[PDB]
A paper describes a structure:
[name] is a 57-kDa protein that is present in diderm bacteria. It converts a diacylated BLP (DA-BLP) to a triacylated BLP (TA-BLP) using glycerophospholipids (GPLs) as acyl donors. The reaction is proposed to proceed by a ping-pong mechanism at catalytic triad residues Glu267, Lys335, and Cys387 ([name] numbering). [name] is composed of two equally sized domains, a membrane domain (MD) and a nitrilase-like domain (ND).
The P2 state has [name] in complex with the final product, TA-BLP. Because map quality is better for P2A, it will be used to describe the P2 state. The overall architecture of the protein in the P2A complex closely resembles that observed with representatives of earlier reaction states. However, the bound TA-BLPtide sets the P2 state apart. Accordingly, the acyl amide linkage in TA-BLPtide is positioned within a few angstroms of the catalytic site represented, in this instance, by Cys387Ala. The diacylated glyceryl moiety extends away from the catalytic center toward the front of the enzyme. Its acyl chains run parallel to one another and parallel to the N-acyl chain, which sits along the bottom of the hydrophobic groove at the base of the pocket. The peptide part of the product is fully extended, and the density for the peptide is continuous up to the backbone of the third lysine. The peptide passes through the opening at the top of the binding pocket created by changes in the conformation of arm 3 and arm 7 relative to those adopted in the M1 and P1 states where the much smaller PE or lyso-PE molecules are bound. In size and location, the opening in the pocket is similar to the one observed in the M2 mimic, supporting our denoting this structure as an M2 mimetic.
Numbering used by the authors:
A (entry chain B): 2 to 6
B (entry chain A): 4 to 508
Amino acid sequence: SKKKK
Amino acid sequence: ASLIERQRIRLLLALLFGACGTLAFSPYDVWPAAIISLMGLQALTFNRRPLQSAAIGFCWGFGLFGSGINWVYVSIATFGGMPGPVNIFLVVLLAAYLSLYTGLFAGVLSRLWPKTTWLRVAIAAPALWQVTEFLRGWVLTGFPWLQFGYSQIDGPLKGLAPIMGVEAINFLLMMVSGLLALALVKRNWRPLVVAVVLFALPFPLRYIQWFTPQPEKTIQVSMVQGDIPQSLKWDEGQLLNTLKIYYNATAPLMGKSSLIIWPESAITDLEINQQPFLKALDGELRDKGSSLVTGIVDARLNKQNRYDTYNTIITLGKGAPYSYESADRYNKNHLVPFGEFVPLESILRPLAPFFDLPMSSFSRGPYIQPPLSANGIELTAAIAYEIILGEQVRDNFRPDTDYLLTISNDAWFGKSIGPWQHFQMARMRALELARPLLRSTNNGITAVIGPQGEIQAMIPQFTREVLTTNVTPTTGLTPYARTGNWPLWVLTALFGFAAVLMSLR
Ligand SMILES: *C(=O)[C@@H](CSC[C@@H](COC(=O)CCCCCCCCCCCCCCC)OC(=O)CCCCCCCCCCCCCCC)NC(=O)CCCCCCCCCCCCCCC
């Protein structure tokens, strides 16, 4: 998925 | 005779039989390799001390997880920020950790059942194998990967999946392989015939279909594969291009495909921020008569005035008007370890530097969630990793479910065997629940799986294209969907309690 932005 | 009683050769030979088990999964699809691999594990642990059997079991596991989940290195090395030697160590540590349960299985099996008899290989080992496999799939949220039950998706034991589940196929595989190992070692044809009969019994079960297809409810489903680069995905500047890529791929599909699916987290920006896009897009879909089911990341307030970041599946269009405060959404429950949350985050915090530990973490959605509604269609959602948890999918499954929904993002692992193994486990859910599976991925295997775990439509990986095809919903409940894993656990309890009670004498 990977969060961050 | 010589140098086979020695443990060194027997320990080295366990790596080969362990590594042989990885050939049984999706990229290779050799289901006899599963039988040979388990046969090697059973045979090599014969007439060994409990500590020596555990070492054999650990090395058998290290062979299986040293080549079956070695694709994790691709995700770790491509975007990990850690030195090269460090990346290799983490993959070794993961293989070593998962090999403990295989080492525990062999260590306990030889301790309580030292003599090589039919009880050990047919009654004791399969019961103990499920207990150790359960612990591997439960401790620290578990990692139920490389289970040999999934290797029989196209094998002759696929008929047992809709009756008891995948965890019963590898239960039966341990019985058959253990009896074959017993026959080979002792040169006795009796364990060989019993192994053949037990393996040939579930074959007519694969011709039984528990579902009645519904031709009157056939729809055209289009799944868009964005093929957004993983490195540039979560960036400011690629957000506008990502929206335009999906919007321009979806615009011709409106009014012709009744259900449109975007991959996991197709919209990278937060749902609260991308409101005008979703509101305008919902208007286009409703007017032309289509529904969109896309993955997004949503941050929600709560009672304590914090933010709970969820991996959400929002639905728009006809049959499901979009609203921020709506119920037609699915929040991911089982987060990926070290990918979406840090297990033992209170203990691994000092070791978080020089380990690329993620600072933030997703919030886990409720274990049981209602099926998604889109254009009068019920979908049982399962985001990426959740499609390998057969028990969780069954719990969320309902009789009114038309299709099984899955959106994933396998762009982390690139050209490796990982996406295929993940894809193979997804096919088992369709076979177990007798429902078509609508799997959409960023660049992975975007495919439509039939009610019997059969690939109906598929598109090549690493391409930016849509998968438009007609899918017919199925109705009817499998015995697995009605009961679950508890009929198997009773069999495990009966085999386990009897095996222990025989060992007590
Ligand atoms: C999105 O939907 C994805 C999830 S994100 C998938 C991707 C993300 O990759 C990255 O973000 C790159 C960096 C990955 C994280 C590295 C962190 C390392 C921290 C230290 C680790 C060791 C700690 C202990 C010693 C100090 O890829 C990943 O998430 C890769 C995950 C790598 C995991 C490394 C594990 C290291 C060995 C641990 C051994 C056990 C230790 C126990 C101590 C008590 N998801 C999807 O779309 C679906 C993906 C499906 C496939 C998922 C493949 C990864 C599975 C990882 C299972 C870990 C099980 C741990 C034990 C329960």
